[model samples]
Target chain A: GFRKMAFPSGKVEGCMVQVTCGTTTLNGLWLDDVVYCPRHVICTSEDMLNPNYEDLLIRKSNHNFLVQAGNVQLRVIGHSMQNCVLKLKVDTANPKTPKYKFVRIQPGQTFSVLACYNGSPSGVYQCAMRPNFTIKGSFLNGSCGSVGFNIDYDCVSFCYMHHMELPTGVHAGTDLEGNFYGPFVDRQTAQAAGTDTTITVNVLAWLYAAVINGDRWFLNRFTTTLNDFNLVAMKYNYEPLTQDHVDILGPLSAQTGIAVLDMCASLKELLQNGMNGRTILGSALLEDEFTPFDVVRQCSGVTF
Target chain B: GFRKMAFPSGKVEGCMVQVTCGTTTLNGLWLDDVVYCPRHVICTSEDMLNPNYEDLLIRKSNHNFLVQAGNVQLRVIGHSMQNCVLKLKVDTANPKTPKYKFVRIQPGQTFSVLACYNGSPSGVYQCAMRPNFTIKGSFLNGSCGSVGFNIDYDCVSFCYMHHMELPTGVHAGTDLEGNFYGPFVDRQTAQAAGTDTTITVNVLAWLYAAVINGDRWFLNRFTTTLNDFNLVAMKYNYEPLTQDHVDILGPLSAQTGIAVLDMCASLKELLQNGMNGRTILGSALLEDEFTPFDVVRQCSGVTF
Candidate 1:
């Protein structure tokens, strides 16, 4: 504290000294030094409020024991208002009177907490702090508590890493994956052998490459069809509309919306349980690109 | 009856405070008037730590703004670390800054934190936190000092969200999907009449019916194919060669090791340009999913 106003006359006879200050480098900003300007720090302290009450990092016991029917998100939260330091306790073995440990998380930082157990008969588990307890609520134990508290530590974020990529080579065009037939049950098998030609059982598959992959410019006017056998001759003899059989079925697909309606009508004409079913045809476009390849690694893994 | 220890009483009455005693509620633990529990009070007092330093809520200048590379993330993090609040501000104006809000994830919780830039020079930005700081040596403008105090928070996790799915129709087999192709780039046309094409593009696409109204069995197969194509094709040509292609390329991709031989071969065949070029085959799978049924309702759109 100086009286600068009156000191203005005190330096009347002072002489200037030429001097250089030596460097005394500071390694870094220290907590104490930060309390001063140039190294600003609003120094403060913390008071513990729930020392006896116990700070808990409770994870729902059901998370560990019972597998949730759907998705059960197990959230482990560590809370500390000021220092953000928490205490964790493990209290599984001696449930009657449990002991506790401690753990912590930094402010604004979140750690793995844990994975949700996606199983059945979900139940509650015990968790406290460091190596928190694990208790399972199950069919045997009955109803469990909703709130979990114990892992006596602060919650904070942690470093995690991961990788992701679209594995195109692993997935490719739709191909003839599989086929299924209507439920003839065992009766159909008997009919197949007994009636023979009366109930001809034919299974047909079509790989029509010209539909989409067709070079429209080069193969213009090209139309794909499934003209099964000599149906053309039969159509001429008793055709109702006098159109080609292919024309009636619209390129030999008894599966389109209209064709399906006609089949329904045809089925109704027959006696109950007397109508037979036939496997007609289908097609798949062919392309070299549809040919599969290998996957080159993109993002590989995640680190946490 | 602690007659020896007790100064006057021959025997002291003892009682468990289960019910009301006289006019007051009394128990084994008692107070002459209405004194607070010693342990409870002490514990509560310690909790004062909760109110020491306020949450540090930093307000950044712009949600997206420019920031010097390697500058202290917190340098731009504007907030007061007073009392018990911790707020984080961001530079929203930085085109390179990731667009994300602040949040705290509790334990046992699964959450995602990502940093992504949407403007020029877009990329997946990374952020790390710690409790200490160190200045890098042999550098001018060494504003990027080492982390001094460990971030009172956690490092948490970060990633690129947009990289996963297209907004229109994110995945294959989804009604909102487009088209996708690739394996090895066979050709690129910076000035070509058409877009780039892979030497052997593995075409994988899905339609609305495939997802919304297709047979359940077909839907399942579609999903399986959608997921499995990459794996199978990522193998090799299933017809003849049996070597695993993914096995060969997986590690190479991880190490960022260029498969020059393969790349060159693929480029020589796919691209018309000399070498060292970037090719992007547009993704139309999601867009395809959104294409109205009317656009492709024609019979020509019909295939096997």
Candidate 2:
């Protein structure tokens, strides 16, 4: 798979393309795309290989510049217009946590780390900081801050959404995620490739993992959405197709009937095994950026 | 009904007896007889009015003046005999008492206050010292030093003996003692004066007082001695007068002849009442100068 790599001179390249310097609408390093910025100060977008990349973003302000994205808010205070010491801070103080981040920003300059907007009290999140930079603050009802940023479902729901596209040319393999799911292809992709079995197996594995991890939100949505009427309707053909051999083949096919009743039996077995008593979340998982509901919403285009 | 009174000129007179002086047998204020020894220093034998009267005796000792009677032992240490500073002390370190007495003596001049040798740890005493002079020491076997003196039963049993003589002419009345039983006259005097009824009444009164006071020793000995056959025998005709008369009188006497049957009946009552819950001394009473036995012994000649 062609993953992006950065050279010593602060230039980033990926997939045999020269990394473009600015957003000239060229397919290259884009502005605001989090990238590895070397200590010498030039910043560039690099393809992040891992979700936990300590990427940076850069911005500049002459006064009290503020950025608001979802529950996250970053405020940059500059001492002067030209050569002011820039103090950028994320207000992570909320009842559930006293969590935030700080950085020494020069006047008129800003940087980006990973940022998340963990919703109400019970939700966990990622915010305007490194993937590993934890957000500590009150989880009580939308407290992190209102620093507005778009929810890029492509990256934000990467781990859970069945529709999430995999990195180009990355072969089917296991990654940091505990279970393998065939290059992270979705249900439709697996079906088009004549490997829908992989989709079923992967979803089952994920469901099992979700249950094992005590991700209650994930289990609830999966069980509910998988049993949706539209998905169930795809199971049986109500009528025959055009007359060419349909009457003959259709009846025979109906008799065999896909050999599997519903994914329920296997899903139930997975659920049961998955619930064989261990459902504790690891400490890292407890601070997960997106909840299962968020994932289900993105994947199924349904509100939780 | 005569009481002696001392005159101002060192002379004491009573009952028409001549006041004798130092062995000239002179019929004047007598030596050896306790008298009003005025500050000028002449002595007389005054018929003292009470047990507490200051009596006098005469003696000359070069070194130690020792006196022993009953459980009492007294020794006077005279440094050289010439104008000795007389120091007298009673070793009254007895477990049962906070009692004893002392006095200062010079060589040859002596005085007699009533002295008692209250034989046991359970006996009260009247030692030869001013009645106001309290003895503070261990009252073990009467170790108060001795000067030549005589014991008058009056002072000896002042606190307890009911039949003892009172100071002459100190008529029937009560004193500091908690009970009253006529002016300390005995059965013989009462009988000789044709006052046998007085004798019987006073004895009865004393008996009642003794019981009331929980005088255990008095009750014990009185019951025992009253039941003695010899004492009983002295009541009727000698030679065991006819057995028929005896038989006649015996039952008659058993029924009505003797006004009092046995002291044991009363003794038992006393014992019962004496044992009546309060016989157990309070902590203070247990540390008092006299035990109940000592009180009874002092009040009655009867010893237990």
Task: Write down the C-alpha DockQ for each prediction.
Answer: 0.01, 0.00
| Worst-scoring 10-residue span by lDDT in model 1 chain A | A1-10
Compose the digit string of candidate 2's lDDT tens values, residues B1-304: 0001000100111100111124211111111211111110112324223211122223333222232222244232321111111222323322322122222321111122111121111111122111121221112112111111211321211121111222221212111121223323222243111121111211232343334333334333333333342233334211111233223223222432232324323433433343332322111011122222222322332210
User: CA shift at B63, candidate 1, in angstroms?
Assistant: 23
The digit string of per-residue lDDT tens for model 1 on B220-257 reads 11122213433443343211111233333333323333
For candidate 1, report its TM-score.
0.16
lDDT values, one for every candidate: 0.17, 0.22
Model 2, span A1-304: residue lDDT tens: 0000000110111100111123211111111221111111112334322221122223423222333322244232321111111122323222222112222211111111111112111111122111211122211111112111112311211121001222221122111121223323212132222122112322332333333323433232232233442243244311111233223223222433321223234344433344342322221111223222222322222210
Among these predicted structures, which one has the highest lDDT? 2
